[PDB]
Write a protein that binds this ligand. Structure first.
Ligand SMILES: O=C(CO)N1CCc2c(c(-c3ccc(C(F)(F)F)c(SCCN4CCC(F)CC4)c3)nn2C[C@@H](O)CN2CCCCC2)C1
Length: 221
């Protein structure tokens, strides 16, 4: 049995919406966002983590291509391997590819492990969002209705399950019979609902929302 509604913002576990700009780094924002919530849960402090650290440093060895795209899973693996990720304040976002400038002096989080969830299992995604925290996912955002979304529960008939844009599921709910996922985007505050989009839930893995979910953990010790 799971709660009907979850919103991790209400628990102080979600940083401000970021603005990725011309750099295709949504995969990096998806990853730091999920890790930011685990960090808050563990330490009580809400700290933006460095998406730029991932763009510059979680590169070819991790199958990623910086501003040309990447994976949250291998972003997490880089953080594990690196034994750290810097704070965003110490290593801020420039929306461009740069040399890796990681400096452990400003490490703001670690990552013990990450977990991947089954493709298309929206019931499994729901349990993880409720019991673990915000979950990194990909969505199919290659539709003008996505770029032009303003408000409400987003449903795009021509959406597919093949994902191309990283986002953060920070909750879910039901608005008078329309079930939705609460999704943090990285297109700044003027996109959608103060930078968030509520996306149709339990509608056959709509827009691939549960195609590739993953979440990191920071274990005691
Ligand atoms: O959607 C479908 C089919 O339904 N995909 C085909 C299979 C697939 C897809 C994704 C996936 C998940 C999240 C995101 C996003 F959130 F960022 F948006 C994306 S965006 C595409 C990211 N890409 C762009 C070109 C390159 F720069 C490499 C990164 C894709 N993961 N996987 C599974 C594996 O292939 C992952 N791989 C396993 C071996 C080790 C490395 C990771 C896309």
């Amino acid at each position: 049995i799971l709660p009907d509604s979850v919103d991790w913002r209400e628990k102080g576990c979600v940083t401000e919406v970021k603005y990725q700009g011309s750099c295709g780094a949504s995969w990096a924002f998806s990853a730091v966002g999920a890790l930011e919530a685990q960090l808050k849960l563990k330490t009580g402090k809400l700290v933006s983590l460095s998406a730029q650290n991932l763009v510059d440093c979680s590169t070819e060895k991790y199958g990623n291509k910086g501003c040309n795209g990447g994976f949250m899973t291998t972003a997490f693996q880089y953080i594990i391997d690196n034994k750290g990720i810097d704070s965003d304040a110490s290593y801020p976002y420039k929306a461009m590819d740069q040399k890796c400038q990681y400096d452990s002096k400003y490490r703001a989080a670690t990552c013990s492990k990450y977990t991947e969830l089954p493709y298309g299992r929206e019931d499994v995604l729901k349990e993880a969002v409720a019991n673990k925290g915000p979950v990194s996912v990909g969505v199919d955002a290659r539709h003008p209705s996505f770029f032009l979304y303003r408000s409400g529960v987003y449903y795009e008939p021509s959406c597919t399950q093949n994902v191309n844009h990283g986002v953060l599921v920070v909750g879910y709910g039901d608005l008078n019979g329309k079930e939705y996922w609460l999704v943090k985007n990285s297109w700044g505050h003027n996109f959608g609902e103060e930078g968030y989009i509520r996306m149709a839930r339990n509608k056959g893995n709509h827009c691939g929302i549960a195609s590739f979910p993953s979440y990191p953990e920071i274990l005691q010790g």
